[PDB]
Amino acid sequence: SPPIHTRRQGFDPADELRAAGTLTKISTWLAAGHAVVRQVLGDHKRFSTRRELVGNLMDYDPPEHTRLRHLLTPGFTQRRMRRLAPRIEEIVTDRLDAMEQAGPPADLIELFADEVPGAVLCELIGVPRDDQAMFLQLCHRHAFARYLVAMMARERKDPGDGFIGSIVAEHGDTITDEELRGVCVQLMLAGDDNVSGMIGLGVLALLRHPEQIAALRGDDQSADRAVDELIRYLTVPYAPTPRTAVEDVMVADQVIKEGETVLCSLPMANRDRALLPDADRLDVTRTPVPHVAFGHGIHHCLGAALTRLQLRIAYTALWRRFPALQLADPAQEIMFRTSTPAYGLTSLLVAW
Ligand code: HEM
């Protein structure tokens, strides 16, 4: 009953999804191989992402996409995101405190996984801390757009040095308040469900492979390689933005007609034995590979650096606080999140 590409079995793609060919028609084309997915995503000239929506990079084609992304790129680099580390550490500590105060057992998803990403996003865009609580409540449920108008008005008149402030000070003439508001809305949508899914599933994956936890508190390479492997192995998004063929195009010896849609199975592409001979195995020590969990090509995840830093901080602080982290009952059923654009957990009752 659920769409083929959204079906999972544990941490893995479902058997019916595994049985699918490289490129087949489904009731829409489904690309389920690493090479074919990278071909489709890398072909931005023949495959368009296009179907409010203003500021949504996933709805832009070049040169319009190139222009808008250029203004956003500098505010998403590894070095710029490293500046948020203290605040991420603070947010994570606050949520760990909430778990510790509640005492064992506690729902890691409700108290930790579903709370961290939103708070980090508020810090990213520069929402004042006192307004952050109400900002998230209005955003999660669907005044929200009305608040952002007032936020852009402050920054345009008197620019700070944050995310919005740096854009309006340097390129205020080329970007509008409507575009800035749209960017912020889309950042909330693109960077909440994905990260919350990764926090939940990553914690469980590390519990299921507990010798691999120690990699997180090693040197920079050790920790980053651990996080990237978890990103690869879990591949939380089922698909990127649907790709529409602008013209007739031959992909994998099959003709994709103009107007037809192609869905890329990111989990299948990252389990492709052409990417890794043992792709179904979790190993935090393996050298990073060109996985497509953050996409491929011009639309590749803008929040990739933020995600890597946030997840590293989240996983590391969790076990530093709770070394004896465990499932509340060893035999408890894993509660998978299946109704959102990203795979995750709805609940994870943990003890320590
Ligand atoms: C679990 C972590 C994440 C994963 C797995 C993920 C996945 C992806 C993927 C697959 C794409 C490509 C979409 C496409 O080509 O159609 C993408 C794009 C994008 N992501 Fe993420 N994402 C994550 C976290 C974030 C975060 C935290 C942010 C916010 C800082 C973010 C912001 C964006 C934006 C703005 C785009 C559009 C880029 C463009 O179209 O040029 N993502 N993401």
TrEMBL record:
Which InterPro entries does UniProt cross-reference here? Cyt_P450 (IPR001128), Cyt_P450_B (IPR002397), Cyt_P450_CS (IPR017972), Cyt_P450_sf (IPR036396)
What PROSITE patterns does its record include?
CYTOCHROME_P450
Checking CDD domains in the record gives: CYP105-like
Recite the UniProt keywords alphabetically. Answer: Glycosyltransferase, Heme, Iron, Metal-binding, Monooxygenase, Oxidoreductase, Transferase
One Pfam family of this chain: p450
Instruction: List membrane-spanning regions.
Output: none
One of the protein's GO biological processes: antibiotic biosynthetic process
Residues reported to bind heme b: H65, R69, N194, T241, R243, H299, C301
Q: Supply one GO molecular-function term.
A: glycosyltransferase activity
The entry's family comment says: Belongs to the cytochrome P450 family.
Q: What is this protein called?
A: Oxidation protein CepF/oxidation protein CepG
Quick one: which gene encodes this? Answer: tcp20
